[PDB]
Enzyme design. Structure first.
Site, PDB file in Angstrom:
ATOM      1  N   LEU B  18       0.814  -1.211   0.000  1.00 44.93           N
ATOM      2  CA  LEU B  18       0.000   0.000   0.000  1.00 44.93           C
ATOM      3  C   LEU B  18       0.849   1.264   0.000  1.00 44.93           C
ATOM      4  O   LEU B  18       0.513   2.227  -0.677  1.00 44.93           O
ATOM      5  CB  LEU B  18      -0.956   0.015   1.188  1.00 44.93           C
ATOM      6  CG  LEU B  18      -1.989  -1.106   1.213  1.00 44.93           C
ATOM      7  CD1 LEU B  18      -3.076  -0.816   2.239  1.00 44.93           C
ATOM      8  CD2 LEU B  18      -2.582  -1.291  -0.172  1.00 44.93           C
ATOM      9  N   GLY B  21       6.266   4.872   4.849  1.00 45.53           N
ATOM     10  CA  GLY B  21       5.953   5.963   5.756  1.00 45.53           C
ATOM     11  C   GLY B  21       7.157   6.357   6.582  1.00 45.53           C
ATOM     12  O   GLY B  21       8.288   6.095   6.182  1.00 45.53           O
ATOM     13  N   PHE B  23       8.371   5.286   9.538  1.00 46.54           N
ATOM     14  CA  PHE B  23       9.113   4.097   9.916  1.00 46.54           C
ATOM     15  C   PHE B  23       8.239   2.870   9.735  1.00 46.54           C
ATOM     16  O   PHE B  23       7.616   2.406  10.687  1.00 46.54           O
ATOM     17  CB  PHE B  23       9.574   4.197  11.372  1.00 46.54           C
ATOM     18  CG  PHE B  23       8.659   5.014  12.244  1.00 46.54           C
ATOM     19  CD1 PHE B  23       7.285   4.810  12.219  1.00 46.54           C
ATOM     20  CD2 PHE B  23       9.176   5.987  13.092  1.00 46.54           C
ATOM     21  CE1 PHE B  23       6.448   5.562  13.018  1.00 46.54           C
ATOM     22  CE2 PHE B  23       8.343   6.742  13.896  1.00 46.54           C
ATOM     23  CZ  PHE B  23       6.978   6.530  13.860  1.00 46.54           C
ATOM     24  N   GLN B  91      -6.966  -4.778  10.795  1.00 43.78           N
ATOM     25  CA  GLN B  91      -8.013  -4.901   9.790  1.00 43.78           C
ATOM     26  C   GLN B  91      -7.669  -4.038   8.594  1.00 43.78           C
ATOM     27  O   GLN B  91      -6.971  -3.030   8.726  1.00 43.78           O
ATOM     28  CB  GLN B  91      -9.375  -4.492  10.361  1.00 43.78           C
ATOM     29  CG  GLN B  91     -10.081  -5.592  11.143  1.00 43.78           C
ATOM     30  CD  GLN B  91     -11.258  -5.080  11.959  1.00 43.78           C
ATOM     31  OE1 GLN B  91     -11.502  -3.875  12.034  1.00 43.78           O
ATOM     32  NE2 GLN B  91     -11.992  -5.998  12.580  1.00 43.78           N
ATOM     33  N   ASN B 137       2.376  10.152  16.560  1.00 46.83           N
ATOM     34  CA  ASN B 137       2.187  10.389  15.133  1.00 46.83           C
ATOM     35  C   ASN B 137       0.717  10.478  14.740  1.00 46.83           C
ATOM     36  O   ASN B 137       0.255   9.793  13.828  1.00 46.83           O
ATOM     37  CB  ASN B 137       2.897   9.331  14.290  1.00 46.83           C
ATOM     38  CG  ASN B 137       3.079   9.765  12.847  1.00 46.83           C
ATOM     39  OD1 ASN B 137       3.173  10.955  12.551  1.00 46.83           O
ATOM     40  ND2 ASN B 137       3.130   8.801  11.943  1.00 46.83           N
ATOM     41  N   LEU B 138      -0.020  11.330  15.438  1.00 48.12           N
ATOM     42  CA  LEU B 138      -1.404  11.574  15.086  1.00 48.12           C
ATOM     43  C   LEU B 138      -1.471  12.603  13.951  1.00 48.12           C
ATOM     44  O   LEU B 138      -0.798  13.635  13.989  1.00 48.12           O
ATOM     45  CB  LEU B 138      -2.188  12.031  16.317  1.00 48.12           C
ATOM     46  CG  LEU B 138      -3.634  12.447  16.051  1.00 48.12           C
ATOM     47  CD1 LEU B 138      -4.335  11.463  15.121  1.00 48.12           C
ATOM     48  CD2 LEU B 138      -4.383  12.597  17.359  1.00 48.12           C
ATOM     49  N   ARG B 141      -3.471  11.759   7.790  1.00 48.37           N
ATOM     50  CA  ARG B 141      -2.982  10.590   7.067  1.00 48.37           C
ATOM     51  C   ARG B 141      -3.102   9.383   7.985  1.00 48.37           C
ATOM     52  O   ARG B 141      -3.241   8.247   7.530  1.00 48.37           O
ATOM     53  CB  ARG B 141      -1.524  10.780   6.646  1.00 48.37           C
ATOM     54  CG  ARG B 141      -0.546  10.770   7.813  1.00 48.37           C
ATOM     55  CD  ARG B 141       0.842  11.216   7.393  1.00 48.37           C
ATOM     56  NE  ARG B 141       1.732  11.369   8.543  1.00 48.37           N
ATOM     57  CZ  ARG B 141       1.911  12.506   9.211  1.00 48.37           C
ATOM     58  NH1 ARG B 141       1.270  13.600   8.842  1.00 48.37           N
ATOM     59  NH2 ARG B 141       2.737  12.555  10.248  1.00 48.37           N
TER      60      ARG B 141
HETATM   61  N1  ANP Z   1      -5.782  -0.504   8.099  1.00 51.03           N
HETATM   62  C1  ANP Z   1      -5.492   0.067   6.805  1.00 51.03           C
HETATM   63  N2  ANP Z   1      -6.369  -0.168   5.703  1.00 51.03           N
HETATM   64  C2  ANP Z   1      -6.085   0.341   4.499  1.00 51.03           C
HETATM   65  N3  ANP Z   1      -4.927   1.110   4.310  1.00 51.03           N
HETATM   66  C3  ANP Z   1      -4.076   1.334   5.382  1.00 51.03           C
HETATM   67  C4  ANP Z   1      -4.364   0.817   6.620  1.00 51.03           C
HETATM   68  N4  ANP Z   1      -3.326   1.211   7.514  1.00 51.03           N
HETATM   69  C5  ANP Z   1      -2.374   2.001   6.778  1.00 51.03           C
HETATM   70  N5  ANP Z   1      -2.825   2.081   5.490  1.00 51.03           N
HETATM   71  C6  ANP Z   1      -2.174   2.742   4.351  1.00 51.03           C
HETATM   72  O1  ANP Z   1      -0.839   2.353   4.353  1.00 51.03           O
HETATM   73  C7  ANP Z   1      -0.047   3.307   3.660  1.00 51.03           C
HETATM   74  C8  ANP Z   1       1.440   3.355   4.084  1.00 51.03           C
HETATM   75  O2  ANP Z   1       1.646   3.124   5.446  1.00 51.03           O
HETATM   76  P1  ANP Z   1       2.084   4.400   6.408  1.00 51.03           P
HETATM   77  O3  ANP Z   1       3.712   4.388   6.671  1.00 51.03           O
HETATM   78  O4  ANP Z   1       1.382   4.314   7.672  1.00 51.03           O
HETATM   79  O5  ANP Z   1       1.587   5.743   5.607  1.00 51.03           O
HETATM   80  P2  ANP Z   1       1.868   7.265   6.169  1.00 51.03           P
HETATM   81  O6  ANP Z   1       1.010   8.264   5.180  1.00 51.03           O
HETATM   82  O7  ANP Z   1       3.292   7.629   6.136  1.00 51.03           O
HETATM   83  N6  ANP Z   1       1.321   7.400   7.764  1.00 51.03           N
HETATM   84  P3  ANP Z   1       2.636   7.535   8.816  1.00 51.03           P
HETATM   85  O8  ANP Z   1       3.947   6.700   8.261  1.00 51.03           O
HETATM   86  O9  ANP Z   1       2.175   7.012  10.084  1.00 51.03           O
HETATM   87  O10 ANP Z   1       3.114   9.098   9.002  1.00 51.03           O
HETATM   88  C9  ANP Z   1      -0.871   4.657   3.816  1.00 51.03           C
HETATM   89  O11 ANP Z   1      -0.888   5.585   2.769  1.00 51.03           O
HETATM   90  C10 ANP Z   1      -2.210   4.237   4.523  1.00 51.03           C
HETATM   91  O12 ANP Z   1      -3.391   4.940   4.241  1.00 51.03           O
HETATM   92 MG    MG Z   2      -0.130   5.677   8.589  1.00 52.52          MG
END
Ligand code: ANP
Ligand code: MG
Ligand code: ANP
Ligand code: MG
Lengths: 283, 292
Positions: B18, B21, B23, B91, B137-138, B141
């Site tokens: 997907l 991010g 980390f 989920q 990290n709230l 996104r």
């Molecule tokens: N439970 C989920 N269902 C569908 N997509 C998800 C879910 N959890 C995370 N994602 C997607 O996973 C992708 C990459 O993971 P992530 O490193 O968390 O993205 P991010 O935009 O950098 N948020 P963050 O790294 O916490 O600052 C995102 O663009 C999310 O929307």
């Molecule tokens: Mg995320």
């Protein structure tokens, strides 16, 4: 002196149509002088007495009034061509209206122009005031670009060429007194001028966008004006509020209007704030 | 009680990725239980110790802390799967983040939601506060949609799973309370800050904070008392709550409890606090008045 060149339909040729309007249809065309050599690009506006009652065979003194005006910031009238329908002939400006411009370019425009056009429009309008010519349809659709930096007021006097007919909108520019009592004055134009600067700074927004026309007078009568564009300090928006000041005698002369925008143009960003990028940085 | 289900790599299968991010890297995949019959849609996040120094073979008490939390408005953790790299399993929410949402829909969204999501986010966050879980990290996104009406806080605790490395942040300082930026001091009230910037994100219909600024200037300007500006849909009431979130004094910032109360009563009259342009440009200003 008070005159105007008359044209012969044999000299004027319409090539393609640009659009219609409140009262008239503008055409792109050429003008072949009695030399018959080359064709000059011109813009032919066609006015009619809708009802098919009166014709435009005779030249009036008003046509001479329009026909004789010349200023750096107006679209001068090259001449008339009488007939069952009136044909006004002016230079052709491929740069289209100023409105269609601030829409396909928005804030990218120099904050220096968005004040240099407020100045320019005001001078032309002041010029018309000098020679007692009321416009009755000043608007951003009715301002044309000549240089990519220079605009020119257009479509003036054209309303006083027709018998009243408040059934055909230009009301969203009309000073309230013109809407109540068909009272058109230089100061009613000033109103119309305010709504035009709005149009400008608003980067081409339709005034009273989602409202109903009949509510336009009431709300206004209740003292509600158009809102402040998101790029104007409260100085550039205060001049507009004066334009809509119910009392004609209170509204600024175009002379005044020309002075403010000229000195406001000495420090463009100090009076206009065009987002470099939502909002940001606010204590 | 404090526990968390452990997974076997034989039960988890990654299908497609997907995105990455700060980390970690999230994958779309399934989970085939020891029944071996059908495959359950799940979301697998992969965390590593970048430097390749430490591994994730051992379960910590913190993983149990994350692993044991459950509230209507969080993305519950289904379980962990230890190994050279950590795999968090939750989920799968096809509705993507809430941010990507308020961008592909803008003001069309009910002004009722844009307040119902401020409430929902606040409850989940209050829940975490209850059980002493700091998020770190709230952001929008990091909020996910479950029902087209219901959101859920996600990606929490995930920072305290790693050794401090303050150069890899390259965001998320544009959400960090200033004290966290100066002194790596993360607290519930530092989250509240991060919460403010998230509502901004919301009402701003998905605008990147400090859009054209430079990251190093972000602390200074802020230190100088300049916050993010007011979104064009917020009364000065919906924007005042955000300004409190960024109130330099931690002890002054609202508890999520307070934050949950305001937005809940503000949600009783949606347009009275939010104003979404039915048309383009401004319009109908109160009759102003010059001075000679
Ligand atoms: N439970 C989920 N269902 C569908 N997509 C998800 C879910 N959890 C995370 N994602 C997607 O996973 C992708 C990459 O993971 P992530 O490193 O968390 O993205 P991010 O935009 O950098 N948020 P963050 O790294 O916490 O600052 C995102 O663009 C999310 O929307
Ligand atoms: Mg995320
Ligand atoms: N000198 C010119 N050069 C090029 N195009 C022009 C020129 N003068 C008028 N036009 C265009 O002619 C078109 C149609 O004529 P017009 O009736 O003036 O339009 P309009 O938007 O209704 N203005 P108005 O009817 O005065 O309220 C417009 O969209 C103009 O911009
Ligand atoms: Mg016109």
């Amino acid at each position: 002196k008070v005159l105007a060149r008359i044209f012969k339909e044999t000299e004027l040729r319409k090539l393609k149509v640009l659009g219609s309007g409140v009262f008239g249809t503008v055409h792109k065309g050429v003008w072949i002088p009695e030399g018959e050599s080359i064709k000059i690009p011109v813009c032919i506006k066609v006015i009619e007495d809708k009802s098919g009652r009166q014709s435009f065979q005779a030249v009036t003194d008003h046509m001479l009034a329009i026909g004789s005006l010349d200023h750096a910031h107006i679209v001068r009238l090259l001449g008339l061509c009488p007939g069952s329908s009136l044909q006004l002939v002016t230079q052709y400006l491929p740069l289209g209206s100023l409105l269609d411009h601030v829409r396909q370019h928005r804030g990218a425009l120099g904050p220096q122009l968005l004040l240099n056009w407020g100045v320019q429009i005001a001078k032309g309008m002041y010029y018309l005031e000098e020679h007692g010519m009321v416009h009755r349809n000043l608007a951003a659709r009715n301002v044309l670009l000549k240089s990519p930096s220079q605009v020119q007021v257009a479509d003036f006097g054209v309303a006083d060429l027709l018998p009243p007919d408040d059934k055909q909108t230009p009301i969203k520019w009309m000073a309230l007194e013109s809407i109540h009592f068909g009272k058109y004055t230089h100061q009613s134009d000033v109103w119309s001028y305010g709504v035009t600067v709005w149009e400008l700074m608003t980067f081409g927004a339709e005034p009273y966008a989602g409202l109903r026309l009949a509510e336009v007078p009431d709300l206004l009568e209740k003292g509600e004006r158009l809102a402040q564009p998101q790029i104007c300090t409260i100085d550039v928006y205060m001049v507009m509020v004066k334009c809509w000041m119910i009392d004609e005698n209170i509204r600024p002369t175009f002379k005044e209007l020309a002075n403010e925008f000229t000195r406001m143009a000495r420090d463009p960003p100090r009076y206009l704030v065009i987002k470099r990028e939502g909002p940001g940085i606010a204590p």
